DNA sequence: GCCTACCGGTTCGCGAACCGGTAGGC
DNA sequence: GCCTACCGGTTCGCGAACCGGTAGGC
């Protein structure tokens, strides 16, 4: 990391580190059952350190100059002990009682909507509101990178406390998590408790949190970096990193026709609270996901389906394309385990592009996932490996796309047929789910870009 | 109205009773005992030694009246008389404390080292076999 | 947990956040517990246990709000208990 | 969180005093 | 051959100063 500028001497002398430890380190503590929730960060630039709430004017700091170098570390070193429990080298680090824990720190030539769209996932600020929501520190978690190997942590941590809510496990067990994983990612709760993390869902919310919050960092990732000369404009630049060929596809084409045809036609009875208005197609190439996917179009039973996702999430789709959820990760929210899921109505998908009434944009994928030959299913079943023979799971709804109207595209079956009843009425299901479990059975097709009309 | 009254009113008598015994016993070994008699009092009685002049009276005169406390029953640390409970203050882990709580916990019997050339005066306060009284 | 905290003075040192004079040793004073805005945890405001209801506060039951009053002598508790009503 | 008055345990500093060696006086 | 007034130095006694660890404040 860079030096704190609560010190007052950031852009003057540079921090220290010996060879390789870097002397600068970022602690926390927090007990859910007193409230504490705290952070201490110290350094070596004088000693310099912080302490106090996290995310609050609640605290204060210590700026001061040593005698010398080498009293620096006896200071350092000292202080960190008494602060953290362990000393300064360790092969694997123990937390203590009551005592802190680490953190680990790390003129343009384009269409006016394909402008529009680097503007709109681009856009950090607007991701940055994006997590304010989820209570996650704000301050700071910009210019400080968050490990990988520490998120993998706070990741398996929600995954222990799915585990220990399945099985009504002891009330301490949960609390252990609890504080391991607030202690692990900052959040700010102001002056009130952090909660408890003993429901289904709320693990499901702070899970949603982590992969939101990676999608930022990968956008940042992108953004900073490249080769800075002047010959290109900026907002090609950042089309360059996306990686992908992007077109607009023209609203007189016959095709275009088709996919507001799919708009219109597949959205849901019962998601009735909004209403749909495509203000763009785009044609989505990404960089040799053709070379990737020519494997799957031998494969039959090949469907153009829809996929909705943040905006926040599309900066890092566009580049690495649709990726299944880490092995780390929990299970819980999804309906039968970790791996692309699609629908083939836009309203379904659309619900995870998270619009407002104040934020009335968003993004909707549609995507040639070759399903091959399908294992259906009507109720909810975590699946770790697939049936002989079967490429792909399908989720049974009751209301299906008529499939007595399925038009075709280009070899691609798209499904624009309004609902009627399904085969079979004994789910848990109301519509559709396609779910591919290798990231090469997917293959982006469109790019949409929908506003919404509420009733407020 | 007239057992309940009386039960009732002979605790708010037991219970000034158990008050100012204790009281009586505290200052009696801030009179004749130093800290670190104190200190070694219940370290010989396997107690976790506070930190506080208070409360380390406080600990003896409950250890003395009451009984060694024995260590918890699944985190093995030190619980602690707090207003109206025994509330263990070990670790059930580095991350959480441990949460136990009791008004009858466990403990063996207070042993005095052979040491006291005044423990026939503060024992001869009419102090017989008794367990704490708690608030209404 | 409480709010309010009572003891007799473990040092002759803190001042009374009233009238702001040394509140000497082993005397009974009262505490309400506020947030320091200097790190994350509860401090005490001590008083004066004369000063204390002259600052508004009303505690309806010490014995329930107020910390600290089990392990008060008894006459000293009824001293409180009283005052608390007047 | 960090700051500091207080506690006991030791050393330090200095003046009385204790002592032995002595050299002018009878 | 004593005595004794004078002086240099080792000792002793006792409060002042020092000091590291810490309970209590904010
Ligand atoms: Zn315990
Ligand atoms: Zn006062």
Known sequence: ??????????????????????????????????????????????????????????????????????????????????????????????????????????????????????????????????????????????????????????????????????????????????????????????????????????????????????????????????????????????????????????????????????????????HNA???????????????????????????????????????????????????????????????????????????????????????????????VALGNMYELKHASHISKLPKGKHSVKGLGKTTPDPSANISLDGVDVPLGTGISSGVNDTSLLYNEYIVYDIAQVNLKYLLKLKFNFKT | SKKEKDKDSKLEKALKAQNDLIWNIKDELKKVCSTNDLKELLIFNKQQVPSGESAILDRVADGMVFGALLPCEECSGQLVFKSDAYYCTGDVTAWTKCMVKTQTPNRKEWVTPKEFREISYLKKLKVKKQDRIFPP | ?????????????????????????????????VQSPMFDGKVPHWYHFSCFWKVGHSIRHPDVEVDGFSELRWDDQQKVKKTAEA
């Not at chain 1, 952070?39 to 210590?62: A, E, M, P």
């Not at chain 1, 996650?136 to 990178?145: A, C, E, R, S």
């Not at chain 3, 001042?15 to 082993?26: G, L, M």
């Open chain 1, 1 to 270: 990391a860079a030096v704190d500028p609560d010190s007052g001497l950031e852009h003057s002398a540079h921090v220290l580190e010996k060879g390789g430890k870097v002397f600068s380190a970022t602690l926390g503590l927090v007990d859910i059952v007193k409230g504490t929730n705290s952070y201490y960060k110290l350094q070596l630039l004088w000693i310099f350190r912080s302490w106090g709430r996290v995310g609050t004017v609640i605290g204060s700091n210590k700026l001061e100059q040593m005698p010398s170098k080498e009293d620096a570390i006896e200071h350092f070193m000292k202080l960190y002990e008494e602060k953290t429990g362990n000393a300064w080298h360790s092969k694997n680090f123990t937390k203590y009682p009551k005592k802190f824990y680490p953190l680990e720190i790390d003129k343009s030539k384009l269409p006016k909507p394909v402008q529009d769209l680097i503007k709109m996932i681009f856009d950090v600020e607007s991701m940055k509101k994006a997590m304010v929501e989820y209570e996650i520190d704000l301050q700071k978690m910009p210019l400080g990178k968050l490990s990988k190997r520490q998120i993998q942590a706070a990741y398996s941590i929600l995954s222990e406390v799915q585990q220990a809510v399945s099985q009504g496990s002891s009330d301490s067990q949960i609390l252990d998590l609890s504080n391991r994983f607030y202690t692990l990612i900052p959040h700010d709760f102001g002056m009130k408790k952090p909660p408890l993390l003993n429901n289904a869902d709320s693990v499901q919310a702070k899970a949603e949190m982590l992969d939101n919050l990676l999608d930022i960092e990968v956008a940042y990732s992108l953004l900073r970096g490249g080769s800075d000369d002047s010959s290109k404009d900026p907002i090609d630049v950042n089309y360059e990193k996306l990686k992908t060929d992007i077109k607009v596809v023209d609203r007189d084409s016959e095709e275009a026709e088709i996919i507001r045809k799919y708009v219109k036609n597949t959205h849901a009875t019962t």
């Open chain 1, 274 to 368: 909004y209403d749909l208005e495509v203000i763009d197609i785009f044609k989505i190439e990404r960089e040799g996901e053709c070379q990737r996917y020519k494997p799957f179009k031998q494969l039959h039973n090949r469907r153009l389906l829809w996929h909705g996702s943040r905006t926040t999430n599309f900066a890092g789709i566009l580049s690495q394309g649709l990726r299944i959820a880490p092995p780390e990760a929990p299970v819980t929210g999804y309906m039968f385990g970790k791996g692309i899921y699609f629908a083939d109505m836009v309203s379904k998908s659309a619900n995870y592009c998270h619009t407002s009434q104040g934020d009335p944009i968003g993004l909707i994928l549609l995507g040639e």
């Open chain 3, 1 to 33: 947990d409480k709010l309010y905290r009572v003891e007799y003075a473990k040092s002759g040192r803190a001042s009374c956040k009233k009238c702001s004079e040394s509140i000497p040793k082993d005397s009974l004073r009262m505490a309400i517990m």
